[PDB]
Design a protein around this ligand. Structure first.
Ligand SMILES: Nc1ncnc2c1ncn2[C@@H]1O[C@H](COP(=O)(O)OP(=O)(O)O)[C@@H](O)[C@H]1O
Ligand SMILES: N#CCc1c[nH]c2ccc(Br)cc12
Length: 327
């Protein structure tokens, strides 16, 4: 069957921490006062929660309340444990409180509020310098969570909040985040379609932190090339074909051969034969202002089929693309 894999960094983090750190099922939730929060307006609803803007009446400060939908209790204790483990880390959203919602009878997670810049405005107006600056800020959050033995598994632009006036970034939505344990087989049904790594698309379960680096590369490619999304699959199968039209099929077959993966036979009639395209193929007069040889080299080192061959978050921070960013 498939050849096993393990991360090339932070392999041992969870074995050297006390069991209390990663055994989220055993964690006893400390409950706050639901009356401290007055809901103001609904911001959104997803598959797993309803999100509200609220006010903490003990300090008149704005907060965001995520009222979880009735779902596997294991998923909720996992998100809480990850948020508590990462609290105070660089650019990680702060979990302010946990209360029992009186209406839903389910947990409501209370987060610090971010006066976030509209997503469309960020996509349309961030400059070359701003993309480098904010990518460096995302890498601080990713190296922190990876160093803490956690993979986000849902890196995408709507999960990165920016308050552009204050040059403040936060990585949010840790509901798909998981503890990395070497040799563990994970569910491939994670991440959003356009940001799914090849490991998920070929059904390789022994993945690691490097899935987040693929997702980050998809975000960067969309931003620098002005193509939303960069890999625009009609479904999870066509998603791999879209990747193969850029990275080529030969490196894809070498990847599946290395890990002794059996490709779904559904791919035999749709994958075709493609050569790798040079990154300059995607440059045009409307994205030239965001492209540089350092941006392309950095992107090339994130967007690799072999998850073990991608830059780690800490190696990425060393890249020349960031030399211009004030530190
Ligand atoms: N900490 C936060 N500060 C400000 N807005 C937030 C915060 N967390 C989430 N939001 C906002 O919540 C809104 C609704 O999210 P939603 O689509 O319901 O999420 P999910 O899919 O996780 O349920 C989004 O527009 C997002 O920007
Ligand atoms: N794509 C897009 C827009 C966007 C939302 N959050 C971001 C964080 C960093 C960078 Br760089 C871009 C974004």
């Amino acid at each position: 069957g498939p050849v096993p894999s393990r991360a090339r960094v932070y392999t041992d983090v969870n074995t050297h921490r006390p069991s209390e750190y990663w055994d989220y099922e055993s964690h006893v939730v400390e409950w706050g006062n639901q009356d401290d929060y007055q809901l103001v307006r609904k911001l959104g609803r997803g598959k797993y929660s309803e999100v509200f803007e609220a006010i903490n009446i003990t300090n008149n400060e704005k907060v965001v309340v995520k009222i979880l939908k009735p779902v596997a209790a294991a998923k909720i204790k996992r998100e809480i444990k990850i948020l508590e483990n990462l609290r105070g880390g660089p650019n990680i959203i702060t979990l302010a409180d946990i209360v029992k919602d009186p209406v839903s009878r389910t947990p409501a997670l209370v987060f610090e509020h971010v006066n976030n810049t509209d997503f469309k405005q960020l996509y349309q107006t961030l400059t070359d310098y701003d993309i480098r600056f904010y990518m460096y800020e995302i890498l601080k959050a990713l190296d922190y969570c990876h160093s803490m033995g956690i993979m986000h598994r849902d890196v995408k632009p709507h999960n990165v909040m920016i308050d552009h006036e204050h040059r403040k970034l936060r990585l949010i939505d840790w509901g798909l985040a998981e503890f990395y344990h070497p040799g563990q087989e994970y569910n491939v049904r994670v991440a959003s379609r356009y940001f799914k790594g090849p490991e998920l698309l070929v059904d390789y379960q022994m993945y690691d932190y490097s899935l987040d680096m693929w997702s980050l590369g998809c975000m960067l490619a969309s931003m620098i090339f002005r193509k939303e999304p960069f890999f625009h699959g009609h479904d999870n199968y066509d998603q791999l074909v879209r990747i193969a039209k850029v990275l080529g099929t030969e490196d894809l077959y070498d990847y599946i051969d290395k890990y002794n993966i059996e490709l779904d036979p559904r791919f035999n009639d749709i994958l075709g034969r493609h050569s790798r395209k040079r990154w300059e193929r995607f440059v045009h007069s409307e994205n030239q202002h965001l492209v540089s040889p350092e941006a392309l080299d950095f992107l090339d080192k994130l967007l690799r089929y072999d998850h073990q061959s991608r830059l780690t978050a800490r190696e990425a921070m060393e890249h020349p693309y960031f030399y211009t960013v004030v530190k």
